[PDB]
């Protein structure tokens, strides 16, 4: 449910710009472990947390989802992202 629900959240909220784990706005900032490690702050420490944080506050071109998603929904989707990034989309 954690990861499995994150999938739902993802298609409904993230797939627009992160189809297939890519990045339709800023090309080189994708959701691949490689990039996630390179550009996400604190990704090596706590992957999920790092992602979750980003999702919550947004960044540059990327809006945050603080009001839109429940904390749970955010954990779930971050968890999904990490899990998907580990296998390679």
Q: Any binding-site annotation on 17?
A: yes
Q: How far is CA 54 from CA 3, 50, in A?
A: 17, 6
Q: Any binding-site annotation on 76?
A: no
Distance of CA 6 to the CA centre of its chain: 10
Q: Any binding-site annotation on 19?
A: no
Nearer residue to ligand HEC within complex by CB, 39 or 89: 39
Which candidate, 86, 77, 74, 2, places its Cα nearest to that of 36?
A: 86
**Under the phi-then-psi rule, with left for phi > 0, alpha for psi from -120 to 50, and beta for the rest, what region is 27?**
alpha
| Residues across the chain | 89
> Judged by CB under 8 A, which of 11, 37, 42, 46 binds a second copy?
11
Positions in 27-86 near a second copy (CB under 8 A): 27-28, 30, 56-73, 76, 83-84, 86
Footprint on this chain of ligand HEC (rule: CB under 6 A)? 13-14, 16-18, 23, 25-26, 29-31, 35-36, 39-40, 51, 54-55, 59-62, 65, 77, 81
């Amino acid at each position: 449910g954690d990861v499995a629900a994150g999938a739902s959240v993802f298609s409904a909220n993230c797939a627009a710009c992160h189809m297939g784990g890519r990045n339709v706005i800023v090309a080189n900032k994708t959701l691949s472990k490689s990039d996630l490690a390179k550009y996400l702050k604190g990704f090596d420490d706590d992957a999920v947390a790092a992602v979750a944080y980003q999702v919550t506050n947004g960044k540059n071109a990327m809006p945050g989802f603080n009001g839109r998603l429940s904390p749970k929904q955010i954990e779930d989707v971050a968890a999904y992202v990490v899990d998907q990034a580990e296998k390679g989309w």
